[PDB]
Design a protein around this ligand. Structure first.
Ligand SMILES: Nc1ncnc2c1ncn2[C@@H]1O[C@H](COP(=O)(O)OP(=O)(O)OP(=O)(O)O)[C@@H](O)[C@H]1O
Ligand SMILES: Nc1ncnc2c1ncn2[C@@H]1O[C@H](COP(=O)(O)OP(=O)(O)OP(=O)(O)O)[C@@H](O)[C@H]1O
Ligand SMILES: [Mg+2]
Ligand SMILES: [Mg+2]
Ligand SMILES: [Zn+2]
Lengths: 563, 559
């Protein structure tokens, strides 16, 4: 339960203390109200039944107090559950953009998806649905056993001995199905990820005839999920049987002690009859905990995933900022070394790009020229060496100053499901309509607005799947150009464009009015016409660099590249 | 349409209702015996009868518990098997819907349908009928028994029952609309979460967390959940208080103590109310909490059956090798928005056809029509003379291979990705396919070799994953090959090598190439210029240059 208290907001701790106090009060009131029947029934069956009025008055007071306490416990549990939900989900939303890219393995991606997917009413009602009834059921027979000490010490001791086996059964119930529940959760998560892949990769799977359940990966995941679920159903039987046997043993102890005291004369017959009802109240929590046992394990898995997302390693950052008012900075690599895992990507790359100039990076596929742009943009951090923007190490920049410096056109354009204009406005949500029109015109998105029937209100699919490749590429270029950053990183932004659109966009990138330090990556010679300087990257090292005319005349790797 | 979906479970549901009625009676039986035990205790009966009644009551409690556990286990197994077969049906159905269904819905909607809607049927087919039968049988039996016992104290038991019924009705009416709106919100949040995870580079570069629509939607959804669950939980807790055994016992005693006092009632006649009057509240609360699950299950069944009734790509019963013909084909992704306008084209074996034109003209959708991801709106597409609507998916995709514009990789080894079309292919075939696609060396440099998993964050470069998909198409080895902007992310040298490998492999095959780099398709037997969804000129490179049309303009722009 310490994991849940870890996730409580600091300003909500007073509510947690009040909730604990009121929960203990509710348990005590229920236990006292159960045991008050014994004096009441002893008096009601005597020669002076009017003595039951006092005990009926006490029962009425305890019952009304229990109603008030349980209503307030419900209110506080609702507030705690939704406060914890809001805090955890906002923390995960704020943390995830700062988590290192290496963290996002398929397992971690699935964990983060599940942790975000827990936002529904089940987790928000955690305290009202699970903790309140679980605590009430666990502590009620203990409170009844304590309250019976005021009626008879051995009877209360027997009730507490029953609580001992209750807690033993509750502890041992989890162990008997931890492995089955873990395997069930794993197979369910795998099935979720395979369903998402099946939806996203539907075309390639259909072309490969890997789409029917007998031949699909999602079908194998479904079979595994069903098998694990059946195994979980079977392996939950021992816990249920254990709770039932704990209840039977507690019944035997309670009723046997009561019968022994009754035949011995220390307990009256009306008191024994009232103790039948007290025993029924005492045994109800045994079944409630058996009902609540699976939900405890499910909640444990949910909170473990949430804490895993909250424990993810955030990238190093700082508090420096760029002093100039968005002027074009210089970009410097200083012995930069980067590796994905153990595979080395960059080998001591060092260069300096002058402020405000347009640089081209060219080279074979896999040579690391996307990694260079990601290092400049701060998406990746060097293993060793420094990336400097205007002499300021990027790792020491404030996160907001870091992203405000760079706008990026990615190699594989990703648009968010929504309108086209919403996707363009991601570059600058506060831009006036004239700036948005200028950005769309520069990126040749204005052609789409007349071709498409809905114009810029056209609904983009998941990704940009309801557009063509070149259309979503131009939308992403418009998004990047809209952002008023002093650094522009272009990553093969004309791959999906015909020659006319390619030439228009290439001219537009240089014809952007504001000054920027532009780094361009392209596999087309016509995409780097306006490049003052060129860097030839091969196997993670800059083989050659210079002007286009100089490199062409040199007859080196640059000339052979375009031969 | 939840009755049509759940029709296979008619006999299990009826049996569960009958068995639950019997189990509820068996669970009430111990307390009648305890009432008789108490009455004999007051009368000072002999120890034999008291032991008999007590042991019988305890054994009946045990029997009822065992029977309830057995029925729950059997019914949960029934529910698990129904969920498994329904999910299999849904996966079979989605496998032949048009791709427009997927593009409109999104991955989050598909996940919600296959997993969460099928899981939302759990209460309806596992607990709903048992809860209803228990909540009808136990209150009726107990109240009849107690009215026979004493009507004066049995009438006050209607007060909590009527209050509970009013609370349950008000809760159901108040929460009905929010339950209807809930799955839409869950789909929206799943879609936003998926986009937040997939678009992480875009989020990081453009605005971070603060400007993301994911955070705004998260706040709106938490607002919806609070507005739904606050009054709902309030009614739920009031119903818990009203039906609680403490409440019933207190009401019974408030009615009975003034009757026992003043001699209007014998205290022995309160024992039925003490021992049975507090038993049926929990069974009432079962349905009270279940009415929301019933609504959720019925809506989920409606959604599932609506997807199961969706029109699909049916294989017609009508029922040169390597030839693909398009005969006046027209297509629209959405009604009234044509994208292909009466296109007629023929692809023959031993020839390469280059399909070029402006971005957005309709080349990829033409390829997708040849794949029958969608059905043409007009005309017909024939492969080897047979309309593709008459072919099965297996027959169609054994004949035509596709390299799509987006290089999609599945979660698995690189061998499993290259061998996607033929999962039982030998490793020698996979290695030679990769060598043809100029990706064998990179795979050999990877740590695990050909068993290295291609998941999220363990990706490749754009050209490398493109070459993986090219190797997949090579390994499939179909008579017809459609290359949709392949080698777009390839550098000139690797592009030349893979193009030469494809030319060697597909020398006698039918090849359709979509290209924006017009310098790569000058050797095509036929060049087709697709502009605004229609063919505007056809010919060779020299003929189209001499014609001075769209092709000459694109060529001039390229240089
Ligand atoms: N997430 C990743 N995990 C592991 N290796 C990666 C990852 N992303 C890229 N790589 C490897 O990094 C090396 C360089 O990748 P990068 O994306 O920088 O290439 P590139 O030069 O931009 O190529 P392309 O021209 O094909 O787009 C490649 O060998 C690729 O395999
Ligand atoms: N799923 C879809 N729903 C609606 N419209 C779509 C969908 N897919 C494509 N379109 C539209 O179809 C038209 C042609 O798209 P298509 O992808 O076939 O073009 P293309 O010639 O291959 O483009 P590019 O060369 O840029 O890849 C475009 O206007 C695009 O907006
Ligand atoms: Mg790249
Ligand atoms: Mg396309
Ligand atoms: Zn269940």
């Amino acid at each position: 339960i310490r994991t849940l208290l870890r996730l409580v907001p600091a300003e909500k701790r007073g509510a947690v203390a009040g909730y604990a106090v009121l929960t203990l009060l509710s348990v005590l009131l229920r236990a006292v109200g159960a045991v008050l029947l014994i004096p009441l029934l002893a008096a009601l069956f005597s020669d002076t039944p009017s003595d039951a009025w006092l005990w009926l008055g006490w029962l009425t007071a305890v019952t009304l107090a229990g109603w008030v306490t349980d209503t307030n416990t419900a209110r506080l549990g609702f507030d705690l559950g939704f406060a914890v939900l809001s805090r955890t989900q906002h923390d995960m939303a704020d943390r995830l953009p700062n988590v290192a890219m290496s963290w996002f393995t398929p397992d971690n991606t699935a964990t983060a998806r599940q942790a975000i997917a827990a936002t529904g009413p089940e987790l928000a009602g955690l305290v009202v649905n699970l903790l309140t009834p679980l605590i009430g059921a666990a502590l009620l027979p203990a409170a009844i056993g304590v309250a019976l000490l005021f009626v008879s010490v051995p009877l209360g001791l027997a009730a507490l001995a029953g609580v001992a086996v209750l807690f033993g059964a509750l502890a041992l119930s989890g162990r008997l199905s931890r492995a089955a529940d873990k395997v069930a959760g794993e197979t369910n998560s795998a099935f979720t990820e395979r369903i998402i892949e099946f939806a996203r990769t539907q075309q390639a799977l259909r072309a490969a005839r890997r789409v029917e359940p007998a031949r699909s990966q999602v079908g194998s995941a479904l079979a595994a999920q069903h098998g694990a679920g059946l195994r979980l159903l079977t392996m939950q039987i021992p816990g249920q049987v254990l709770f039932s046997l704990a209840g039977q043993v507690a019944l035997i102890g309670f009723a046997g002690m009561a019968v022994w005291l009754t035949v011995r004369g220390q307990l009256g017959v009306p008191e024994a009859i009232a103790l039948i009802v007290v025993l029924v109240r005492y045994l109800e929590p045994f079944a409630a905990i058996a009902d609540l046992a699976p939900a405890l394990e499910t909640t444990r898995a949910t909170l473990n995933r949430i804490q895993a997302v909250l424990d993810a390693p955030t990238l190093p950052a700082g508090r420096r900022r760029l002093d100039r008012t968005g002027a074009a900075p210089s970009i410097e690599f200083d012995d930069v070394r980067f590796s994905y895992g153990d595979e080395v990507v960059l080998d001591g790359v060092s260069f300096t790009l002058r402020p405000g100039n347009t640089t081209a990076i060219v080279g074979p596929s896999g040579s690391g020229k996307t990694t260079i742009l990601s290092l400049i943009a701060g998406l990746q951090q060097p293993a060793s060496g420094r990336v400097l923007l205007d002499g300021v190490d990027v790792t020491t920049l404030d996160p907001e100053a870091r992203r405000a410096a760079v706008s990026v056109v990615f190699q594989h354009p990703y648009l968010f499901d929504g309108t086209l204009r919403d996707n363009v406005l991601v570059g600058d949500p506060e831009a006036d309509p004239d700036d948005v029109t200028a950005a769309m015109r520069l990126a040749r998105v204005d052609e789409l607005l007349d071709r498409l029937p809905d114009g810029d209100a056209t609904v983009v699919g998941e990704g940009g799947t309801a557009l063509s490749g070149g259309e979503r590429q131009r939308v992403s270029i418009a998004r990047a150009l809209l952002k008023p950053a002093p650094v522009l990183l272009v990553d093969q932004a004309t791959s999906a464009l015909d020659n006319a659109n390619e030439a228009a966009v290439v001219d537009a990138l240089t014809a952007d009015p504001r000054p920027r330090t532009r780094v361009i990556v392209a596999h087309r010679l016509a995409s780097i016409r306006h490049a003052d300087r060129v860097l030839f990257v091969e196997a993670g090292r800059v083989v050659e660099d210079g002007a286009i005319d100089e490199l062409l005349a040199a007859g080196g790797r640059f000339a052979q590249f375009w031969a | 349409a939840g009755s049509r979906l759940l029709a296979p479970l008619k006999k299990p549901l009826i049996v569960s209702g009958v068995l639950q009625a019997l189990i509820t009676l068996i669970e009430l039986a111990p307390f009648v015996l305890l009432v008789e035990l108490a009455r004999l205790l007051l009368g000072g009966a002999e120890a034999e009868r008291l032991w008999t009644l007590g042991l019988t009551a305890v054994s009946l409690i045990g029997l009822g518990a065992v029977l309830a556990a057995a029925m729950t286990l059997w019914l949960h197994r029934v529910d698990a098997r129904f969920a498994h077969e329904l999910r299999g049906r849904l996966l079979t159905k989605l496998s032949r819907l048009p791709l427009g269904w997927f593009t409109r819905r999104g991955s989050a909607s598909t996940k919600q349908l296959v997993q969460d809607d099928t899981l939302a049927l759990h209460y309806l087919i596992t607990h709903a009928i048992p809860d209803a039968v228990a909540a009808v049988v136990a209150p009726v039996a107990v109240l009849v028994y107690l009215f026979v016992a004493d009507w004066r104290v049995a009438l006050v038991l209607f007060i909590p029952v009527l209050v509970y019924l009013v609370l349950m009705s008000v809760m159901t009416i108040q929460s009905g609309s929010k339950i209807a709106q809930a799955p839409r919100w869950a789909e929206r949040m799943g879609g936003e979460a998926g986009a937040f995870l997939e678009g992480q580079p875009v989020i990081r570069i453009f605005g971070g967390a603060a400007a993301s629509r994911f955070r705004r939607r998260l706040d709106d959804y938490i607002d919806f959940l609070v507005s739904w669950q606050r009054p709902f939980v309030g009614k739920k807790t009031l119903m818990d208080l009203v039906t609680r055994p403490a409440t019933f016992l207190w009401i019974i005693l408030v009615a009975g103590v003034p009757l026992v006092v003043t001699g209007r009632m014998d205290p022995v006649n309160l024992l039925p109310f003490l021992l049975l009057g507090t038993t049926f509240g929990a069974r009432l609360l079962g349905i009270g909490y279940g009415l929301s699950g019933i609504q959720t299950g019925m809506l989920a069944a409606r959604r599932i059956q609506t997807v199961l009734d969706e029109p699909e790509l049916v294989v017609r019963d009508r029922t040169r090798p390597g030839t693909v013909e398009l005969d006046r084909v027209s297509f629209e992704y959405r009604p009234g928005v044509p994208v292909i306008r009466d296109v007629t084209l023929t692809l023959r074996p031993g020839t390469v056809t280059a399909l070029v034109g402006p971005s957005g003209s309709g080349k990829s959708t033409l390829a997708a029509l040849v794949a029958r991801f969608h059905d043409v709106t007009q005309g017909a597409i024939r492969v080897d003379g047979r309309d593709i609507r008459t072919l099965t998916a297996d027959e169609l995709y054994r004949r035509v291979g596709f390299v799509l514009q987006d290089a999609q990789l599945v979660h698995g080894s690189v061998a499993e990705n290259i061998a996607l079309a033929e999962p039982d292919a030998g490793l020698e075939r996979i290695r030679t396919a990769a060598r043809d696609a100029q990706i064998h060396d990179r795979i050999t440099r990877m740590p695990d070799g050909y068993d290295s998993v291609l998941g999220a964050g363990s990706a490749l470069s754009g050209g490398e994953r493109q070459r993986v998909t090219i190797a997949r198409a090579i390994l499939a080895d179909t008579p017809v090959l459609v290359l949709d902007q392949a080698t777009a992310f390839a550098d000139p040298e690797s592009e030349y090598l893979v193009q030469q490998a494809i030319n060697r492999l597909t020398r006698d095959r039918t090849v359709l190439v979509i290209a924006h780099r017009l310098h790569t398709i000058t050797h095509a037997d036929q060049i087709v210029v697709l502009d605004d969804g229609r063919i505007v000129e056809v010919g060779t490179h020299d003929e189209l240059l001499a014609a001075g049309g769209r092709y000459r303009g694109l060529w001039d722009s390229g240089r």
